[PDB]
Design a protein around this ligand. Structure first.
Ligand SMILES: [Zn+2]
Ligand SMILES: [Zn+2]
Lengths: 356, 356
């Protein structure tokens, strides 16, 4: 396989389905990328967490993230900046670990180097997150810095031969909710040139209507022939609507967070399995789900395990939620390929929000 | 298969290996019986817990424990009395649930009925636990009551046709550490007649030397041609020494308790995987273990998962510990069948206690 090749196999409206080929494997798009410490074609590693425990140099000494996690397929790492204080400047950010008080710095160059030590296949440029809401001036200043940092990230990546030849680099569009800033950001990223383009700054609590409004104008600004990654999104209905707006890749902690907190995703909406209404419910978590949990165990049993404090309950919930997300993506890919995605999205919303 | 048939295939000293055939399956002995909410031939259900959540009538409405847990092989239930206050008498015990304040009673008859509603295959007689240490008078009084309750348990079981025809009933020897009381108890149980005989009252904090001393004289008092079940034991070295003294069946919360608290069992002794010495250790939890965890992941990765708070870490630890216990029992059975159990026990102890 090539280092990186994105091909679009079919389209419906703004939605696309296709493949990213990389040395370690093929990624089917639209893709959901689960956290690896939770089938999927690619998993996400949390650079901020890994640089603090066990440390990037230690991960490299252990053979890199692929060996460490037992995962030989592609891995995407974030830059570490979002989760990341002792000092902030045009150079980068300095911060102190709560785990042990150790001092750490992150910059475009250091973030790229940490991601190199982790051995990831898709590397994210290091940027400055923009809070929500943001004034036009603050959003512009933050976006402008992020574009300077995108060039620094590009140069650092290109200087590391093993990384340049075997990994890929994505740039991140910023600009808050402002169309003109989103355009300036897209133009700057395309001038630098990246293997894929993320839409940043939209997992900030703005609400789905506003997120969709910004995606409506922002995704068309990115190169059509490269993947589009919506970072930190989201709920099943967020994913469906974002695909309708041209997004190809997603990540979110929701499936694993929900699975540890009693919430299961189903085609009839989320359910809180701890509720007493499930104590005698012999149906599986979801009646169509093909996952191993739903083939074997009832809502009543999973309810019991969680209420009893048994670790097995949260594990089965998490397994189901991860599988549900992958089945959602498979249905999205098949429906786009078959020219029935618009109908799928309509049928999906009607059932998901009925909450039956 | 028959309702119940125990056959001894081979012996070495006081140790035995063989099979219990029941309608739902064959149990290879010596057997370790894990809790089912945690391969094994039989799992243990906790009657006290199940009668409080979700309730025995509710379990029966859901189809019984086999259907509820997705386990079609034999299940052994305890009587509920050990974990079980509003009143205590020759009739039984009354107690109030902390979960919701509901009132509950347990007696020989009610315990047998609850175990019937749960649908278990091996039913334990309801007895009175003897604290440790106990005076001779108190141990005798408690043992005498337990024998009266054993007869009541026998009669209640025999009155329920579905239970009498399809399940088995074990009696429990009591008597604390006193040889004469252990003998009186064994005589009373054999006169009543049971399908198997447990050695009760030895998971009480007395220490291994004392436990082995009591087993030395107590196990020979039970019928040789029936299974011998040591309740609530134990650590790997406890199991090996108890097999050397004629025990056929075991249960203990240690593998699952340890797996949720950072402790892994290995042939070189227990290890606390959270310790910093494992942060860079690329070996599996145990170098001989055939379990799925040890085929794939390192001590370093499991250390990381647990230190990071990831549920996956405790799940992998528990999976490894359950599998380790089953591999221990398999090695015990094979060595007895091959006439090399004495050597196995010696080699096991030398390595386990070296702690290398
Ligand atoms: Zn499922
Ligand atoms: Zn193992």
């Amino acid at each position: 396989r090539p280092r990186f090749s994105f091909s679009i196999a079919a389209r419906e409206g703004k939605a696309r389905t296709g493949t990213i080929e990389m040395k370690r494997g093929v990624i089917r798009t639209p893709a959901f990328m689960p956290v690896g410490t939770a089938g999927a074609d690619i998993i996400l590693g949390n650079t901020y967490h890994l640089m603090l425990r066990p440390g990037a140099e230690r991960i490299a000494k252990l053979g890199g993230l692929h060996s460490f996690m037992g995962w030989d397929r592609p891995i995407l790492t974030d830059s570490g900046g979002y989760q990341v204080l002792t000092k902030q400047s045009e150079e980068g950010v300095t911060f102190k670990s709560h785990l042990d008080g150790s001092r750490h710095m992150l910059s475009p160059e250091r973030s790229i180097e940490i991601q190199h030590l982790l051995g990831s296949d898709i590397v994210m440029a290091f940027d400055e997150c923009t809070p929500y809401p943001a004034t036009p001036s603050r959003a512009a200043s933050s976006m402008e810095r992020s574009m300077r940092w995108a060039k620094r990230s590009r140069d650092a990546f290109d200087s590391r031969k093993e990384q340049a030849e075997n990994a890929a680099l994505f740039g991140i569009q910023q600009g808050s909710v402002f169309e003109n800033l989103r355009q300036q950001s897209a133009d700057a990223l395309a001038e630098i040139g990246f293997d894929g383009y993320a839409v940043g700054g939209l997992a900030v609590g703005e609400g789905q209507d506003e997120m969709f409004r910004v995606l409506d104008f922002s995704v068309p600004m990115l190169p059509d022939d490269k993947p589009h990654y919506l970072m930190g999104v989201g709920k099943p209905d967020d994913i469906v609507g974002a695909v309708e707006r041209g997004i190809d890749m997603f990540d979110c902690v929701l499936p694993t967070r929900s699975g540890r907190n009693g919430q299961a995703f189903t085609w009839d909406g989320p359910i809180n399995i701890r509720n007493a209404r499930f104590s005698e419910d012999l149906k599986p978590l979801d009646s169509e789900c093909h996952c191993a949990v739903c083939q074997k165990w009832s809502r009543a049993f999973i309810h019991h395990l969680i209420r009893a404090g048994e670790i097995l309950g949260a594990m089965l919930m998490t397994e189901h939620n991860i599988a549900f997300y992958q089945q959602l993506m498979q249905k999205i890919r098949d429906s786009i390929s078959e020219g029935r995605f618009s109908q799928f999205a309509q049928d999906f919303r009607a059932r998901y929000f009925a909450r039956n």
